[PDB]
Amino acid sequence: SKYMTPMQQKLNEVYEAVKNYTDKRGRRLSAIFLRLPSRSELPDYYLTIKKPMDMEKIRSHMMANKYQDIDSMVEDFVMMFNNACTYNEPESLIYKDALVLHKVLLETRRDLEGD
Numbered sequence: 001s002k003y004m005t006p007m008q009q010k011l012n013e014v015y016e017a018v019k020n021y022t023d024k025r026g027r028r029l030s031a032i033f034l035r036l037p038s039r040s041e042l043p044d045y046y047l048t049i050k051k052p053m054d055m056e057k058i059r060s061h062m063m064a065n066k067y068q069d070i071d072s073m074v075e076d077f078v079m080m081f082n083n084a085c086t087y088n089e090p091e092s093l094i095y096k097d098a099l100v101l102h103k104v105l106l107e108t109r110r111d112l113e114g115d
Ligand SMILES: CN(C)Cc1ccn2c1[nH]c(=O)c1c(Cl)cccc12
Pocket: 032, 033, 034, 035, 036, 037, 042, 053, 054, 055, 080, 081, 083, 084, 085, 087, 088, 094
């Protein structure tokens, strides 16, 4: 069916709020987070990040209908943001963008608390 259940609609709304967020200059902060590069590209990344995560992984899990609740999706986004803030320096743009998208995530979930 093309009709999503209420839980599926809520998962999709959360995912899309993070994906689609743009700053005041029109930059889509999710860009860098869509797909993690390889070991070759980020030498230290897979040696230092225990549980790699990107938005394509979350999206595919969502599309396979494998998230049972909203907390489960939020957990994977929070993992991704913690990973970004572990690998990257606090002065880096990626670290700053992770912090903004984390707020988008939490604000979106809270604004759907009644739904
Ligand atoms: C270019 N550079 C130093 C880092 C870089 C470039 C790509 N990505 C990162 N760092 C990340 O942690 C990261 C995460 Cl969570 C998810 C997806 C992509 C990421």
